[PDB]
Structures are given as structure tokens and as C-alpha cells.
Amino acid sequence: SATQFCDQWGSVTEGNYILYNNLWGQAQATSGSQCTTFESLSGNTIVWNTKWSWSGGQGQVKSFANAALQFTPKKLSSVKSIDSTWKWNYSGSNIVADVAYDMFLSTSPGGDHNYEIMVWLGALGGAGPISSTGSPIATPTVAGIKFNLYLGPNGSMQVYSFVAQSTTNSFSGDMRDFFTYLESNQGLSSDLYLVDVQAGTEPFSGSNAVFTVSDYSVSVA
Structure with a gap:
């Protein structure tokens, strides 16, 4: 049943997902808060949302509330598929935020993340990716959608970011x-090894935002 939590590290486990509030970037805000709500789970499909207002820390992500799939890590060469379906919606005022898959690679199943791959379905209000130059390295079409592709380091990783040219809910x-x-x-x-597959939103600023995931699924085959 419905479970709503507002604390920085709030989470809940459902089927094959752990849903996180994950306010890792709170401290870069002058102001704001955020609550995440699990609604329901149906087969491998999760329905949830999060609500937030944030201000200050221009260009810093305040959080990354997401659903993370729990699975046994696999080398990319042994992966047959990663089928996913996602429907989302945003509402509220002056929104700066992304909507993104975040998938992480490592050299061993338990190792640190050396790569990060993001797939942005949504770039709202100026939200910008990690990039060394600020410009695309390429503009490939992948899984039927045209992307601007970015590359840059963050943490102790390299991050590739596929940013869809049209907002795609x-x-x-x-x-x-x-x-x-x-x-x-x-x-x-x-x-x-593919070791984490997470889908959510990264907000920078706005008020009375509501990010509504009316269905999300992913499986690693």
C-alpha cells in the first residue's frame, strides 16, 4: 500500500525495486524539501511519485529520487536484453530538472563504478549534463530516439549522457x-559488468513540482 517518506535517505523495497528519496544534494540548496511516494506494484511494474520544491545552488542537483532494480550483475557481453517501459509527467512552476535512467558499470560485480550512462527523456528548464566541452560529441539515434551525446568525468567515473532532442514522456x-x-x-x-539500473528525476530548482511515474518497468535478461 501507499508509503510516503520525506527524510534525506528514505527508501522502501517492493518486488525487485528499492525506491529512494536520496536527497544527496540538499546541502547545496538555500531552501526546499522533497517527499517520495510509492503507490503500487503490479507484476514488475511500479507506480510512484515525488514532490518537491528547491531553490539556490544554481547548477547543482539537489537529489535523485529513483526506482533501482535489484538484480545480479552481468557482463555486457552476456546481456540479451534490458527491456524497459516508462511513462511520466511533470507539473509545477519554474522547473529545472532532468528525467533520466542512470546505469552504472564496474570491472567486477562488487567493484566501484567506473562508468555511468544516463539516458535523459526530459531536460526541463535548462538542466544540463556532465560534459567536458559543454557540447555534444555526437548526435546518434538509439532505440528510435535522436540524442545529443555528452561525455565528462564526475566523481571518480566517466559519464556518458544521452539527452533526447525532444522531451519524451x-x-x-x-x-x-x-x-x-x-x-x-x-x-x-x-x-x-552492468551493476545498477535506476530511473528517476534530478531536480535543480522549482516550486510545487510533482513528478508522476504512472508506470515504470525494467528487467535485465
Whole structure:
């Protein structure tokens, strides 16, 4: 049943997901808060939302409330598919935020993250990715959608970010296409392990925002 939590590290586990509030970037805000709500789970499909207002810390992410799939890590070369379906909606005033998959690679199943791959379905109000130059390295079409592709370091990782050219609130596709692409056109090794697949939103600022995920699923086959 419905479970709503507002604390910085609030979470709940449902089927194969852990849903996180994950306010890691609170301290870069002058003002604001955020609560996340699990609604329901149906087969491998989760329905949830989060609500927030944030201000200050221009250009800093305040949080990344997301649903994370719980699975056993797999080398990319042994992955047949990562089918996902996602429908979302945003409302509220002066929104600066992204809506994104965040998928992480490592050299061993328990190892640190050396790569990060993001897939932005949504770039609202100026939200910008990690990038060394600020400009695309490429503009590939993957899983039927045209992307601007960015690359840059953050933490102790390299981050590739696929940012859709049109805001895209409905999506169904094989997330493996993004890896096929990188292995093929950017030298990414397929010997690496997929170790985290997370989907949510990263807000920078706004008031009375409501991010509504009316269905989300993913599976690693």
C-alpha cells in the first residue's frame, strides 16, 4: 500500500525495486524539501511519485529520487536484453530538472563504478549534463530516439549522457541499444559488468513540482 517518506535517505523495497528519496544534494540548496511516494506494484511494474520544491545552488542537483532494480550483475557481453517501459509527467512552476535512467558499470560485480550512462527523456528548464566541452560529441539515434551525446568525468567515473532532442514522456525499448552503441562507436569494453539500473528525476530548482511515474518497468535478461 501507499508509503510516503520525506527524510534525506528514505527508501522502501517492493518486488525487485528499492525506491529512494536520496536527497544527496540538499546541502547545496538555500531552501526546499522533497517527499517520495510509492503507490503500487503490479507484476514488475511500479507506480510512484515525488514532490518537491528547491531553490539556490544554481547548477547543482539537489537529489535523485529513483526506482533501482535489484538484480545480479552481468557482463555486457552476456546481456540479451534490458527491456524497459516508462511513462511520466511533470507539473509545477519554474522547473529545472532532468528525467533520466542512470546505469552504472564496474570491472567486477562488487567493484566501484567506473562508468555511468544516463539516458535523459526530459531536460526541463535548462538542466544540463556532465560534459567536458559543454557540447555534444555526437548526435546518434538509439532505440528510435535522436540524442545529443555528452561525455565528462564526475566523481571518480566517466559519464556518458544521452539527452533526447525532444522531451519524451512515453517510452518502451531495449536499453541494451545504448551499450551496443558505445561498444561499437566509443570503445566501451563489453567485458564490464552492468551493476545498477535506476530511473528517476534530478531536480535543480522549482516550486510545487510533482513528478508522476504512472508506470515504470525494467528487467535485465
